Symmetry: C2
Subunit: 270 residues, 2 copies
């Protein structure tokens, strides 16, 4: 019955809006400068970053950066912190997925473990366009160029993010679509360590059905968007890897730099 | 048109049948499946490997284990020769796909370049079971346990393929199913260096519609099988990424050998 799958879709979309403060729709309204009811401050260089606090609340070194906790490090920890923020929202959203909280606690954890980062990059896309990404809840916009020019290492951490964002956004999915896709990602079943694989696959099959009908119904003219979207799932895996290793490099070349334990936790390499 | 998609399917099935000698139907009958009208020589130890390579039809090397080209290497060189044969069979099959030969030649090359590995591992699954893989046109069977007890480097080579094969074959796809799946993999559109993506995706979109109807008619009670098969494509992607990796590692083992040149060519890299 397509009727029960539309109800699952509505349920998920409803929860999604409740768990993520900045929707893609609000993101695009902000990025498409035509809608100027409140526009973002743009950080495109060391000078813009400096004043990026005069107006926007950035509890981070406004002045000199080098000998005083360099800019590259601060920007990084800024995203680091933004990631944990997302991990808590994604975690809250996951609890609303029917069947999820009834799964063995150990698997719920495993599902969140590997799913979170793939979800963070999918949703990060919503705040991006070829030239940059929205920051501080959309109050700001940091350029893709400014980020590409930071300290040797920290200069290629966001690049593969925009690469993915670019091709992912070309699909033109909206929040109602993303809510089901994100749900699908959390309930994989091919994660390492899962104790009870069947119960997870059964829920995912239902989510898969919901997503299929949803796309068929919201993008009637987009042939095979469903197949197209499922494959992007490999681009996500590659980003996580590159990120984890580039993360290990900072680990030993910046021993004075810390990493949030939540992120450090969902971070069991390999 | 339903009939149109049914025509594309039987056509790919027929081409598949003529390009690929050993069918999964044929391989299944041999493997775990009883059907004893011709049994394979089982290679489960070094002795059986010697007492087999000097008896099984293998036009390359022979039993040589002791200061005479080690076993792990001889076996490695064997799957290389096998993989190179598989490339020629996959190539002929691609040409049978409607629209493929109409594409810009450079693109045709690109699609095969980055597609043959994913295809090779997909069809390898058909020759595998949780215990081993059929060898030599199906005249042999090399145990999984044996392949994993090889020299440090070579002992982790086939395992990640068995893991994949085990999960993949669970979907119980037959040859008419696979014929379309492979065609879909070939016409990706997201391969690096492609000059004209539109026609490629139009064709794959046509191929995806044919696989979909095929899975629905051939597996009416197999729910969301279509979505599950597509999610396995990323599984292929990873295996490929991991393979070329452990491979580059081998590069730092077998190298400078003034007699390998004309053979190094034949096996370039892919």
């Amino acid at each position: 019955e397509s009727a029960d799958l539309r109800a699952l879709a509505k349920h998920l979309y409803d929860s999604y809006i409740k768990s993520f403060p900045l929707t893609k729709a609000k993101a695009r309204a902000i990025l498409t400068g035509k809608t100027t009811d409140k526009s973002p401050f743009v950080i495109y260089d060391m000078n813009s970053l400096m004043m990026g606090e005069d107006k926007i609340k950035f509890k981070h070194i406004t002045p000199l950066q080098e000998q005083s906790k360099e800019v590259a490090i601060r920007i990084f920890q800024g995203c680091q912190f933004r990631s944990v923020e997302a991990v808590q929202e994604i975690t809250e959203y996951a609890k609303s997925i029917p069947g999820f909280v009834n799964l063995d606690l150990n698997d719920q954890v495993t599902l969140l473990k590997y799913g979170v980062h793939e979800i963070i990059y999918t949703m990060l896309a919503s705040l991006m366009n070829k030239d940059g990404v929205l920051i501080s809840e959309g109050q700001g916009f940091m350029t893709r160029e400014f980020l590409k020019s930071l300290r040797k290492p920290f200069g290629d951490f966001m690049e593969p993010k925009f690469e993915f964002a670019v091709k992912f956004n070309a699909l033109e999915l909206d929040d109602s679509d993303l809510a089901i896709f994100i749900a699908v990602i959390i309930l994989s079943g091919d994660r390492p360590g899962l104790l009870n694989v069947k119960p997870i696959e059964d829920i995912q099959d239902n989510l898969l059905q919901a997503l299929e009908l949803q796309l068929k119904l919201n993008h009637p003219e987009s042939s095979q968007l469903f197949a197209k979207l499922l494959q992007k799932m490999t681009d996500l895996r590659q980003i996580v890897t590159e990120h984890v290793q580039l993360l290990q490099v900072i680990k030993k070349t910046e021993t004075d730099m810390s990493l949030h334990p939540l992120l450090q936790e969902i971070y069991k390499d390999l």
